[PDB]
Ligand binder design. Sequence first.
Ligand SMILES: C/C1=C\CC[C@H](C)OC(=O)C[C@H](c2ccc(O)cc2)NC(=O)[C@@H](Cc2c[nH]c3ccccc23)N(C)C(=O)[C@H](CCCCN)NC(=O)[C@@H](C)C1
Ligand SMILES: Nc1ncnc2c1ncn2[C@@H]1O[C@H](COP(=O)(O)OP(=O)(O)O)[C@@H](O)[C@H]1O
Ligand SMILES: Nc1ncnc2c1ncn2[C@@H]1O[C@H](COP(=O)(O)OP(=O)(O)O)[C@@H](O)[C@H]1O
Ligand SMILES: Nc1ncnc2c1ncn2[C@@H]1O[C@H](COP(=O)(O)OP(=O)(O)O)[C@@H](O)[C@H]1O
Ligand SMILES: Nc1ncnc2c1ncn2[C@@H]1O[C@H](COP(=O)(O)OP(=O)(O)O)[C@@H](O)[C@H]1O
Ligand SMILES: Nc1ncnc2c1ncn2[C@@H]1O[C@H](COP(=O)(O)OP(=O)(O)O)[C@@H](O)[C@H]1O
Ligand SMILES: [Mg+2]
Ligand SMILES: [Mg+2]
Ligand SMILES: [Mg+2]
Ligand SMILES: [Mg+2]
Ligand SMILES: [Mg+2]
Lengths: 371, 371, 371, 371, 371
Amino acid sequence: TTALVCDNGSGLVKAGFAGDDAPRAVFPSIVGRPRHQGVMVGMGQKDSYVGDEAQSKRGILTLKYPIEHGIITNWDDMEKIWHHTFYNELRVAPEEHPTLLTEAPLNPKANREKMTQIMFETFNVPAMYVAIQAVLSLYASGRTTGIVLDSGDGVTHNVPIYEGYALPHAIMRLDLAGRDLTDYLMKILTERGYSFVTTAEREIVRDIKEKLCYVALDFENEMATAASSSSLEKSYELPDGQVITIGNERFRCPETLFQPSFIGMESAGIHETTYNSIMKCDIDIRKDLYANNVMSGGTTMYPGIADRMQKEITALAPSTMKIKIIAPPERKYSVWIGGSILASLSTFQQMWITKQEYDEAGPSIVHRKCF
Amino acid sequence: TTALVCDNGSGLVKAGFAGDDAPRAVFPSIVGRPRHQGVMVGMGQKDSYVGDEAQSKRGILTLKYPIEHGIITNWDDMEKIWHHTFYNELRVAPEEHPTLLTEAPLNPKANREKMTQIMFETFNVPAMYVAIQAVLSLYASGRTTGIVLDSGDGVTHNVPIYEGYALPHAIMRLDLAGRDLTDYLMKILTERGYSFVTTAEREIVRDIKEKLCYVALDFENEMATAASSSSLEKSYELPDGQVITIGNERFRCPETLFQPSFIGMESAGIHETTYNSIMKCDIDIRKDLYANNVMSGGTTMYPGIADRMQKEITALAPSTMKIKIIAPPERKYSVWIGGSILASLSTFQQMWITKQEYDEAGPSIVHRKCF
Amino acid sequence: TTALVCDNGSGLVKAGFAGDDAPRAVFPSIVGRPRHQGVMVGMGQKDSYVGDEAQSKRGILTLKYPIEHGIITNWDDMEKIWHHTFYNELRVAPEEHPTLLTEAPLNPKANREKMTQIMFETFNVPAMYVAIQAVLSLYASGRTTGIVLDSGDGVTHNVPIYEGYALPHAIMRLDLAGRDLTDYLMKILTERGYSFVTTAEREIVRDIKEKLCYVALDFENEMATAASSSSLEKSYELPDGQVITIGNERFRCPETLFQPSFIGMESAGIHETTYNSIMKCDIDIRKDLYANNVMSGGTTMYPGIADRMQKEITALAPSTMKIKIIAPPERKYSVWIGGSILASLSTFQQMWITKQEYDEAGPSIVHRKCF
Amino acid sequence: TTALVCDNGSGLVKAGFAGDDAPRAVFPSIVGRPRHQGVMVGMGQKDSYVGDEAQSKRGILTLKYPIEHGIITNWDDMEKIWHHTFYNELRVAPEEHPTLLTEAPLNPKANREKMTQIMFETFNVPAMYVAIQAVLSLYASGRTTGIVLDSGDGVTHNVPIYEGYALPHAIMRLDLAGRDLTDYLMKILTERGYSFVTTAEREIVRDIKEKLCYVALDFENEMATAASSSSLEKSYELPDGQVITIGNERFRCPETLFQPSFIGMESAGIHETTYNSIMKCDIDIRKDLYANNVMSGGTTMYPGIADRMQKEITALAPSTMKIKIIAPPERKYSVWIGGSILASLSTFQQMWITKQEYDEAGPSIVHRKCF
Amino acid sequence: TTALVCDNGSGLVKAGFAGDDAPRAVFPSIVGRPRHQGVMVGMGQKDSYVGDEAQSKRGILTLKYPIEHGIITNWDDMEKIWHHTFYNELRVAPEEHPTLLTEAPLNPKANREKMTQIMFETFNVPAMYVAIQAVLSLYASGRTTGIVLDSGDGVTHNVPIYEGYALPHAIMRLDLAGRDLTDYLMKILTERGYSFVTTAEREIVRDIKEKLCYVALDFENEMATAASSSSLEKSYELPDGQVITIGNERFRCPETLFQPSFIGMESAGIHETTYNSIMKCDIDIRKDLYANNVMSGGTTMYPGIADRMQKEITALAPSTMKIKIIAPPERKYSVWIGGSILASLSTFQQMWITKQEYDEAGPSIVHRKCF
Ligand SMILES: C/C1=C\CC[C@H](C)OC(=O)C[C@H](c2ccc(O)cc2)NC(=O)[C@@H](Cc2c[nH]c3ccccc23)N(C)C(=O)[C@H](CCCCN)NC(=O)[C@@H](C)C1
Ligand SMILES: Nc1ncnc2c1ncn2[C@@H]1O[C@H](COP(=O)(O)OP(=O)(O)O)[C@@H](O)[C@H]1O
Ligand SMILES: Nc1ncnc2c1ncn2[C@@H]1O[C@H](COP(=O)(O)OP(=O)(O)O)[C@@H](O)[C@H]1O
Ligand SMILES: Nc1ncnc2c1ncn2[C@@H]1O[C@H](COP(=O)(O)OP(=O)(O)O)[C@@H](O)[C@H]1O
Ligand SMILES: Nc1ncnc2c1ncn2[C@@H]1O[C@H](COP(=O)(O)OP(=O)(O)O)[C@@H](O)[C@H]1O
Ligand SMILES: Nc1ncnc2c1ncn2[C@@H]1O[C@H](COP(=O)(O)OP(=O)(O)O)[C@@H](O)[C@H]1O
Ligand SMILES: [Mg+2]
Ligand SMILES: [Mg+2]
Ligand SMILES: [Mg+2]
Ligand SMILES: [Mg+2]
Ligand SMILES: [Mg+2]
């Protein structure tokens, strides 16, 4: 009846209905299991906990993420998350509405084929479609031309779009994402003697990162300042009441996005990746892509990311070029919003894969580009 | 028919039926034998006396405790106690009801294996189960999360439980218990010239301890006060009418629980043991364990123990943490009560070791964790 | 057939049959011999006289007591007494009934071994047993707990018994007895010019003591009163019609029992001896022993002994203790009665030393404690 | 003059001079203090005992380890150990030779900064350097490529090295180490009724572990065998002459290294940790790392560890890959030996931090990577 | 000037000067008073007699011991003994030398406080110290490690010492001592008809014990032998020329030390007490304590005590343990000798309580442990 929109982002499930300006259900993409004992099956105990349950009880659970680098590998856990998304969070049977899913570009074909099989055989979804997140993000901004840099939990990717058309030969993908920034920070923090090694401890570091980190406009000068100025340090209170101090780690973590070599990657930084995607595009397109660099995704939340990227692109770009970073306060939900918008358009209504077409055509249909 | 509950606590047998809010049979875990002469077997004399008999006639008997540090070592005497518990105190044949027994954690495997053999071969018990006392105590409070400090006659132990799950790597056990506090007091009292050296005299000191001792909130200031203030002294009338005066011994005895070094132990005090058990638990669990420290067992009867423990944990705990000591007027019977509750639950009804399963499986079955 | 009971008390033989509530034969334990001439063996004259004969003819006989301080030393005279007890007084052959004898505690082993040899070799007694008098006295009262103070002619002794058991480490024995009280009075009376130096004269003093003496409740005040009040004096008529006056000697004689130093002893008085025996007993026993101090034996006949002992024990005892003196009108025969009772019990019937066991085991059997 | 090499390993100090093929001074990293009384300061008594003294007198001392999980926390005790290492064991003044120290990777920066301050301000060391143990261990083997698994007393760590270069993004660290294996065994042994709770008792368990434990090649089959076969049990004689029997505990203890969940950890087993470190390395490096897995450190002493690790890596590794475990009889001293070798090289002679450079540069110099 | 050493042992005063290898003054701790008459104060008569006077005139005196179970209760008599020790036996004014006193462990605090008050207020002693006898005895042997069993007249005690340190939690005290052995023998001897009931008679029994008793290596076999062999009997000549025969009483008396139940005690025998004190000590200490069991005190004079104790400890000890009894010919004076040694050491010279410190600090100073 109303298209259902579900962004199976790494680390976070965002879902709601088309026409809604926000997801209704927002919870971690986490499935947890008991760590220290078995399940008291003859008593009030469960085999697994999901999303908010997984977080509330995280101190006794081993937590797993079914999605790694944007690819679903743990299909059983992925179904558990969907099972709750549909029946406990949105509380809607799948048989009632068509569903729009999202995906990072350049994944295994199997990832689409398996999501499709599940949505038609485990959940009886009337029709479905799987969209690229960068495209939806641009729909959310309302522009037809620009380059979208979606930097999430598992994948960072750049998809230039011009006058509504994709420029696929220029799509670039990095493995570096929020999951790695968290892991890097866990390692950085051992320098101050704070050792976080368990899964729940990983979740704490993630929370620290989210509240304390920022992007230095000038890393070296910020670091030189940090070396002597105590004004850089901030305290953080841990769940058990202990208090720790975070210093230059507040900006050394996100710096990884500009310098991937910090974690051993040969990868381009986000400002080099963006630049190269633009350079792979036609000379008469480049002007507009520089003019409209569009940010989206949770890692773009670090304060100052917009200014640092403006500086870096400007430095790489021709001196007579106008460079602008577009970074609305709603970047975190850009994909979800784009989903809601697209799902409600009369043009999109013609692109759905119905169950009947799927059953007759088979899995190859998921690679259909109807438009 | 009705599960029978029997807490074979060191120094005291507490038994009754499931569904009863109190034990029906409460008597000392003591077997006595004549000290000065043989048994007039051709006349009205016995070889041994048990429980109340052992106490009423204690002046002519050598008394023994079959349980040391929570471990049954004198199996013949243990059977004599059970023989009376079933046939003279509760006056029920074992063949009529299933029986729930209790145990301290981390004992020899043999202790469970031997109790089981006796309950199926000497007493024909239809089915049985042996539970950990800390767990039962938490059932009695009705909470699912908290740390239970059971401090009895032979063992003091700490078992953290979270959301119904055990956290076994954090179980801590101390040897210090009520039996040692009594022995320490017997030694302290020689300072005033009161020498208690026989077994019956030990029982008198135990009675003195029970009526006069308290926990100083501040040991050093209480002691400094005691040094000059006569208001600290209390009289006690001995069974033969002689009267003695007890001074600072009233609080020096229980202080041992906070300072085990007084009796030569390297052991943590009860407030350090509790704290460390909490620190061995996951950071996202610790908050609730601090919030709910649950006391149980006879040594927690000393007036003021709740306030002294509150002070000590608070001092060790983070300053932003909420610490609360839970110490109901019924702590002495918490294990028994938990026994009654568990025994009546439909979940527990599935966990019993039946005689038939025992006979086929053998003794290894006692280590079964059905739940 | 019927056990024969014979109490070979110093100075007096009391014998009868088990089941009889009184001895049938009561006569002095005295053997006399002619003093002034030889025996007219060719005429109607005897070599010796026994018991009543010894008393009726005492003015011409030297009289001897075969028992000194409870120990038989003159075995030939002891046999003469037994010879008459069996054949002239009870008129029963020893071969017809088993015999129960009595003894003071802590005597030479030989005393039991010799009585046994005589009873199996001179008198053909089927079986025998030698009992402690304090024990029999307690049987006579019917109590199982109490301390018995048997004060007879040759020995005074204290045997605490608790719940039917002996407490042998607390048995105390004094040499002071009725024989000494008589000798002391003979010496006191020389003060009034009445000199009694022969054996028959000793018997007269014994008779005077028996009729005139009493225990002062308060010796010093009684003596101070006696110093000026003629109401204290009593007359006594001697066998030859002469009349003498006895004054404060009436209470100075029995006072010796409270003050043994009057006759040169280091010994405890009877109230100190009783007290110390109780103090040597376990603290949880002492309460009952104070509650039941049981008197027996001929020296307890002095009027007022019960009240004086009540005063003295009360003074030594704790102020919150209940002290009671048990002193029935039948104290003089308590041992004999206890003998009759024990002899008739089915438990006692198993404890007898038979002649056959004696002949095979030898004399060591007399120290058997069958019970 | 000659570089001094000192491996401040947790639980054991190994020191000697560069060029020496073995440490000269090997003693426990233990500082002990009197447990039952104060120090008789006016007599022949000490405040503390160190190393061998701490062990010889351990029955009266509380013993402490200044190093926990590879981190020095008790700096005063650490200086006492160094004080003896230099003046009593090696008997060399620090002013005479430069010193090479060792460290686990990923520690607090402060650990290096504090060791440096002590070595320049308390001990006047001419120059110093602090090396990573895994690196030294590889120098000891003589290889330039391989992965080193150093498993000691407080830390287990994996540092892949390729063609002389570190691959730091793949360094993995576990908390599980010999100290935990000992604690686990102390808990396992309560099953047989052997309770070790004091510090000296901990040292006994450590000795038991060292002589009796081995790694099962197949844990489940070894355990199933142990269940019925008495050939598994071994006796051990305790210091006081008592004898105890150890059964399957001989292999259940070291099994923890393959299954850390036995002690509540979420940690990878040693064979998973090694495997993952290799997988984090470049695909063209992995082949050599599989070929050369190098073991070092005291926990690798358990007999059979080499074969069990060979089995586990082989199972995880590709089937066409050659996997080899390198485990020389000298693994226990690999770090010390590597120290001696490096210290004598002409390349290393250029890397020393001199006192003068330290005084001018300050503590940040300890993080210098001169090479 | 020279420390004075005075061992106020129960029943015997041993005193001399530090540096002397023997006491100069050795006499009974006895105060006697006239028994049969008053004091002829207008003639050559005294109110009391002390020590040797008390013994020479014992037949007319009641003798008292001011010390019972190691505790001074008759303070007036204690001063009379000290009065003679200082002025008639050593003939030294107390004002001239500092004095070292001895004490049994675990006495009333008052015993030290009162001895101190007397030594500073009745006798003007410059300085004093009160030492534990077990400690001094070990000084006399010259060992620093061993367990000392001091068995004297009123108290038997066991104080383990390791490497010069006390292990106070393992101090054990028995009431059984030489005074009880004497009383038991007085009771045993009534079996042969020898009744000793006065105080002087007690002294005779003490002399008999000292010359005739021995410890059976094997009590039951010695007793079985004694039952038929006349070679066991020995004669003894009494002060009045009468001769008595002592048989198995020669070994039944000292047997009490191994079997305290003979006199009604629940107490451990001396070999059980020693064993338990060792078992209460740390496992790494026990080996040396078994190796060095040190005997001291007058009751260890019975011939054969060393061999019987060797047998008993060996039987209780582990079979691989080396057990040795140390029992020099000088055991009787070990405490005195240790006193002389300690008193002369430069370390001890710092531990004295001076009169000035006492006057300012008050009685609590007597519990000072300066060392
Ligand atoms: C915030 C946080 C910890 C800090 C607690 C407190 C507020 O601060 C300190 O006290 C710092 C203080 C400090 C000590 C010394 C110094 O030279 C400089 C610093 N660190 C230590 O003791 C460290 C030591 C440690 C253990 N393995 C490590 C691995 C790498 C680095 C350090 C460690 N230790 C006990 C923890 O990290 C523990 C447990 C880790 C192992 C679990 N298997 N971890 C936590 O609780 C988590 C939530 C992290
Ligand atoms: N303010 C913030 N700063 C840094 N990281 C953030 C912030 N907010 C969210 N994140 C990170 O973004 C990721 C989730 O955001 P999102 O892009 O929605 O993930 P996904 O699209 O994979 O669901 C997490 O890694 C989270 O820590
Ligand atoms: N009010 C009290 N104060 C101190 N100790 C007490 C008190 N009441 C009981 N106890 C002690 O508690 C012990 C018995 O209590 P309990 O915990 O039930 O023992 P158990 O569980 O071993 O049977 C005894 O050591 C007893 O002296
Ligand atoms: N009423 C009395 N007052 C004082 N003494 C008495 C009295 N009656 C008996 N006796 C004394 O008691 C002794 C005999 O009593 P008894 O106890 O039966 O002696 P035994 O038990 O030795 O045969 C004699 O010494 C006698 O004088
Ligand atoms: N044969 C062995 N088996 C098991 N553990 C051992 C063995 N030898 C030594 N160990 C353990 O190794 C640790 C000390 O070795 P080492 O690696 O040198 O420690 P560190 O490097 O921390 O000084 C201790 O925990 C010790 O018990
Ligand atoms: N050879 C011996 N055999 C048995 N007992 C002895 C011997 N010598 C002395 N005694 C006993 O030892 C006690 C006195 O010795 P001692 O230990 O010096 O006493 P104290 O230390 O109390 O002064 C007395 O009880 C005495 O009888
Ligand atoms: Mg996303
Ligand atoms: Mg209990
Ligand atoms: Mg009588
Ligand atoms: Mg190491
Ligand atoms: Mg002595």
